[PDB]
Design an enzyme around this catalytic site. Sequence first.
Site, PDB file in Angstrom:
ATOM      1  N   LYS C  85       0.791  -1.401  -0.251  1.00 17.14           N
ATOM      2  CA  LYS C  85       0.114   0.036   0.005  1.00 17.14           C
ATOM      3  C   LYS C  85       0.970   1.231   0.003  1.00 17.14           C
ATOM      4  O   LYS C  85       0.502   2.442  -0.489  1.00 17.14           O
ATOM      5  CB  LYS C  85      -0.943   0.022   1.214  1.00 17.14           C
ATOM      6  CG  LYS C  85      -2.481  -0.424   0.959  1.00 17.14           C
ATOM      7  CD  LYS C  85      -3.251  -0.530   2.303  1.00 17.14           C
ATOM      8  CE  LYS C  85      -4.488  -1.191   2.028  1.00 17.14           C
ATOM      9  NZ  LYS C  85      -4.665  -2.521   1.320  1.00 17.14           N
ATOM     10  N   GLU C 107     -10.174   6.728   3.388  1.00 16.37           N
ATOM     11  CA  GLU C 107     -11.189   5.534   3.664  1.00 16.37           C
ATOM     12  C   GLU C 107     -10.284   4.507   4.248  1.00 16.37           C
ATOM     13  O   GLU C 107      -9.174   4.208   3.556  1.00 16.37           O
ATOM     14  CB  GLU C 107     -12.068   5.312   2.521  1.00 16.37           C
ATOM     15  CG  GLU C 107     -11.909   3.895   1.988  1.00 16.37           C
ATOM     16  CD  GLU C 107     -11.065   4.050   0.632  1.00 16.37           C
ATOM     17  OE1 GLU C 107     -10.704   5.230   0.542  1.00 16.37           O
ATOM     18  OE2 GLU C 107     -10.228   2.914   0.618  1.00 16.37           O
ATOM     19  N   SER C 375       2.159  -9.571  -0.642  1.00 17.73           N
ATOM     20  CA  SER C 375       1.693  -8.148  -0.400  1.00 17.73           C
ATOM     21  C   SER C 375       2.037  -7.638   1.047  1.00 17.73           C
ATOM     22  O   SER C 375       2.077  -6.229   1.266  1.00 17.73           O
ATOM     23  CB  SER C 375       0.250  -8.017  -0.943  1.00 17.73           C
ATOM     24  OG  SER C 375      -0.550  -8.748  -0.089  1.00 17.73           O
TER      25      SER C 375
HETATM   26  C1  LIG Z   1      -4.399  -3.698   1.991  1.00 20.75           C
HETATM   27  C2  LIG Z   1      -4.305  -4.999   1.712  1.00 20.75           C
HETATM   28  C3  LIG Z   1      -4.807  -5.783   0.773  1.00 20.75           C
HETATM   29  C4  LIG Z   1      -6.087  -5.665  -0.078  1.00 20.75           C
HETATM   30  O1  LIG Z   1      -5.429  -5.134  -1.216  1.00 20.75           O
HETATM   31  P1  LIG Z   1      -5.659  -4.674  -2.845  1.00 20.75           P
HETATM   32  O2  LIG Z   1      -4.129  -4.933  -3.399  1.00 20.75           O
HETATM   33  O3  LIG Z   1      -5.708  -3.513  -2.998  1.00 20.75           O
HETATM   34  O4  LIG Z   1      -6.588  -5.802  -3.426  1.00 20.75           O
HETATM   35  C5  LIG Z   1      -4.186  -6.953   0.508  1.00 20.75           C
HETATM   36  N1  LIG Z   1      -2.978  -7.516   0.965  1.00 20.75           N
HETATM   37  C6  LIG Z   1      -2.528  -6.642   2.329  1.00 20.75           C
HETATM   38  C7  LIG Z   1      -1.351  -7.119   2.868  1.00 20.75           C
HETATM   39  C8  LIG Z   1      -3.133  -5.688   2.317  1.00 20.75           C
HETATM   40  O5  LIG Z   1      -2.669  -4.971   3.679  1.00 20.75           O
END
Ligand SMILES: *Cc1c(COP(=O)(O)O)cnc(C)c1O
Lengths: 264, 264, 387, 387
Positions: C85, C107, C375
């Site tokens: 993010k 948000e 992610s």
């Molecule tokens: C914020 C969040 C998401 C949700 O994700 P999008 O990429 O916008 O679909 C996914 N993984 C993590 C670790 C998150 O913090």
Amino acid sequence: ERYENLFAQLNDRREGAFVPFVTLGDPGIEQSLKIIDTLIDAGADALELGVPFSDPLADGPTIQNANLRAFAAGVTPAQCFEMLALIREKHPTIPIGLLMYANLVFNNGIDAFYARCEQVGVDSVLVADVPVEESAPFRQAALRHNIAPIFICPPNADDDLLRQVASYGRGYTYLLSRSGVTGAENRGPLHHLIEKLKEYHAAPALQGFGISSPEQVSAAVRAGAAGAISGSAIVKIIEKNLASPKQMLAELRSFVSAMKAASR
Amino acid sequence: ERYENLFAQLNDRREGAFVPFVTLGDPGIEQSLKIIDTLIDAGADALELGVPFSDPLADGPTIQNANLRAFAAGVTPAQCFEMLALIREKHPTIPIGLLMYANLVFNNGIDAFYARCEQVGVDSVLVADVPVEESAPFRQAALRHNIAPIFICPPNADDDLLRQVASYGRGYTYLLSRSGVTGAENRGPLHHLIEKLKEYHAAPALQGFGISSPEQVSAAVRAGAAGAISGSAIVKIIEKNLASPKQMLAELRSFVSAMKAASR
Amino acid sequence: TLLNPYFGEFGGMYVPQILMPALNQLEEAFVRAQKDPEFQAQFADLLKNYAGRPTALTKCQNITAGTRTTLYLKREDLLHGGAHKTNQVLGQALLAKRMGKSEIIAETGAGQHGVASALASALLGLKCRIYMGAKDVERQSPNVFRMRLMGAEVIPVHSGSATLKDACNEALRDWSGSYETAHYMLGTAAGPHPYPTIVREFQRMIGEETKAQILDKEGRLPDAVIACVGGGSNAIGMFADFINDTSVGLIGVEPGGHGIETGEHGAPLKHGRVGIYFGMKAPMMQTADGQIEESYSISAGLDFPSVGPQHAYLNSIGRADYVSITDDEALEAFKTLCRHEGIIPALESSHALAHALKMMREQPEKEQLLVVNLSGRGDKDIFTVHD
Amino acid sequence: TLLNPYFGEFGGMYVPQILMPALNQLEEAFVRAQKDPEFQAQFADLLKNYAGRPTALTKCQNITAGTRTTLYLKREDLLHGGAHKTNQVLGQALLAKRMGKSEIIAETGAGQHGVASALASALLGLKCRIYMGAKDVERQSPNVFRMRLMGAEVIPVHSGSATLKDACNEALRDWSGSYETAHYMLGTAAGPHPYPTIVREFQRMIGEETKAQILDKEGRLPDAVIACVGGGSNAIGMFADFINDTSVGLIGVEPGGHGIETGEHGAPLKHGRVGIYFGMKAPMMQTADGQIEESYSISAGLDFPSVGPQHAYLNSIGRADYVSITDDEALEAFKTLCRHEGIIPALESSHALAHALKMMREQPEKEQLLVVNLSGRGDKDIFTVHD
Ligand SMILES: *Cc1c(COP(=O)(O)O)cnc(C)c1O
Ligand SMILES: O=P(O)(O)/C=C/CCSc1ccccc1O
Ligand SMILES: O=P(O)(O)/C=C/CCSc1ccccc1O
Ligand SMILES: *Cc1c(COP(=O)(O)O)cnc(C)c1O
Ligand code: NA
Ligand code: NA
């Protein structure tokens, strides 16, 4: 020369030495002085005494609790040396050895610690956390004050080490039965070390760690050692009988008489 | 041509239009049908009606709660069109406009949604979340079913936009008093827009957002607009009198009579 | 507009008329920024010296032992903030500043986007306002506190279901009256144009770095790249640079919750219905009457009740494929990475790992060069997995 | 020995005779490893592709505004695990493997060293055993759980004060009977030789990277480098490469707790007394009779009741200087970095930041190029600062 005399006398009797261990002030100063007198009266040949330390890193559960019980009664090192003086005033010839951790002897100055031992009548000092590589100042200080410096010979000793131990030590040589820490919980072939130590004219050997039964002391003697040290087995009888002081002493008597008889 | 007739009649009387807003089914279906009849009887010239949606993103607190109260009574879109049909069966000439959010009209097919409005007697439809840039399918569908497509002219409109709004819309032109969302909480110079809209032959303008007092409707008329829409001020009287239905209607009467008188 | 607002049938600009000039302004500032080497150098410095770019690409040897699969993980969990993010917010914050804006609106559901927006605003001197549903505020005390510690104002939204959906409503409501001084920092690759395009572009570097990285270490492009999909930003960030490499598979994973069949899930792209909401035409969690519904998952972060328009497009033409993974399946992959690799993954990312694990386990003799986008960090989820 | 076990009057090898061969074995394996390019390449790959090396050096422009100080932060908080501790454990784990060992013993207070040892053992396939005082286990549920999730055995020590000290005792007790198959992964730059030397060397890269980094960006070496001191590893890691650069100041910060004057602190180097314990001769928290005492601080991680022998040495010859920082002073620096830079620092690292902040605030017109080592992440401390 307390140890030298004892060993000559025992050899004369073709006897091995039985040496029990206790922590000074466990469970209290008064009961401790009483415990020690019973130990001698029942047949101990020499004494191994520990002063309460906060971090006994070479001791198992039983002795860890011996220190804890002494701390609960407020026993300090100064109180210990007071006890030591009174013990000698009562028994003039029995060899007395202290089991010490490094900080308690460095704290106030290494030299002054050995001067105090002399003053009180202590015969030897074994510092659990000082190997031969780091023994110089403790060794020099002990000799200067007529205190015997005790060295530990491990089961995994090389010739260089055996030669070192034989050359520096005095009183007796602490022959470790096992690897690990103190504890009657786990039992522990040492014929080669004993003969090599004898070859290098080292001080008579006393086997320590895991000794808790009569058969164990007769085996130590049979192997060539001059005696055996027993701690956790002694301390466990104290632990078991805290609520009944009279029963504690009576039980301590039976155990040490049996152990002493096995060294004959 | 419900709106066209109303405006010709009002101009004939040199009168402005007073148009109140309510959410269908707030606080209940029966009390709502009763609320609407009182609204007409007290003097409303036209009606602006919202169907309950879960996410009204162009509405402030008062109207957000209007939707919440309707949801609590189980009011569905199908129930709404049933109410709409009965309202027309009772009042044949009053213009009726629906305030809609996009999903409710796309959900079942854009074309079929406008076919339903025709069937029931609805006159216009304003979709809060569709700008002119995205209006093609909604525009085409409305015209095909004799429903007037309402466009919003913001206070920050450029000539290109004014020309667009004037060309596509029908019924009336929704002239925004302010920036922001609905709410009688915050009050909202529009002379230039009104004249430009008049120049491009746009549908008569109705001012909306923040209108809650009589002086406000007389000012709208004085500026050149054909009328004024009021929602939060109407909905607040419902909220205030939930425990007393009789008192609710009586209070609704006094307010709309006063507001209607100011358009004269 | 200067650019196309649609990806096939999906996307658009479904917002009230009052906000249309704010979207045109944004679009134009983005097009200009992209052509300005001064902006590019600034964005690159922040990424490198503040965020920790480039992130590592780690080979997972233990987990794949006994099979013919080679698996690598893109380490977005090592980025400042613990999630991908951060890349996005830094870029969007510079755009707001380029536009002359001094205030930021944001948000958040589980708190991650909120924490990221708050840190970027503190660094670049912007006044931050954050909307969060009252039910989520109650559920997310640690993140709410982190946000406030960073100087941001947190505002509970008690309307509707009091969750993400309702916070998304409040943000636009606010922006419609404050656009002249405030910029809306949207949190995923969704919403009205140009947001899906901008978020992709400020997340491109994930896949761009992955290409050079795998080329150096393996001398070949991967057979497939896998990513979880809450709203779509980390996934499109990974996919982007590989779109033109026809031999590279693109796989997105949506939350299956208690099972699709129970109706308790968070997979609108594959098991929802196309609708219009949040300034977008896209698949959505919805009732029969068209009322907007909530998304369900063990991971709080995969709760955006819709999906990015570019994914719905890539899916329709057959360029990318999408699947789902259940709560228990994600818990299992989470447990396994901790134990065999020494890495604690976010429950969000665990959905992607779980699908790569299936691909292996189901056909252990298939030769496969795989890349999963990790992610985020999972320290966040320790007590959840515990109870 | 092959190397000198003392740093002036401090250090040594104060352990029972039974453990002396284990220390000689370790020493020799380390000397060999350092001359082996194969080991070096392996350690570098793990650091780079698994841990995230090199870490960024971030300029903190907001915090220093209005003064003549330029401040940079070495980002060890961005390292896998959230702390510097990771560098060390990877290297020590490879040494154990080079030695033929299959088991790892470890000690921990607040849980950080424990979490690091557990992740390294999982990655390199070693069986991990961890000792923790019962009072700390109760106080540190999240970390205990992370450890277990990583496959490590956690064992509560109920002896003594049931804290770090007592866990350190139990570890050596265990090793004295298991050295033949197990390696003791000591957690700081202290204990018996060769541990202080080995830990330094496997932490050297922090300062080595900092030099090239500041030289590139500023074209000059710093006026001073500042670091907190719990046991001494992150500090010596930073100091090492700069020891021969006489113009660069070296500053270490010890915890002052409620105030030195109250006797409730954790600063033995400056306000303790030299003693012998834990296989070392060094300053220590001790009673008048020589009984070992506990260290006190708001940060749980700065509780090792002694200090590394190399620091006691650098202090005596005047090469480095040491100061202390109180609980309130550390809380203040923590609060300030969150607010002005968007970074949440560990309460441990906040002690170092607090001293650099004093250096600035006290003499705002002094030209100063400063580097603070941000040894870790502060997400850990959110609830503590909260209550
Ligand atoms: C914020 C969040 C998401 C949700 O994700 P999008 O990429 O916008 O679909 C996914 N993984 C993590 C670790 C998150 O913090
Ligand atoms: O309980 P034991 O019989 O197993 C051993 C008692 C030994 C007392 S002396 C001693 C010697 C060396 C290291 C620690 C000690 O406590
Ligand atoms: O409460 P008001 O008087 O301030 C405005 C009422 C307007 C009803 S119609 C309408 C029109 C546009 C967007 C949202 C709406 O609800
Ligand atoms: C582990 C720990 C410390 C204590 O450190 P030493 O470097 O060995 O003195 C300091 N900071 C952090 C963040 C820690 O986790
Ligand atoms: Na979604
Ligand atoms: Na310390």
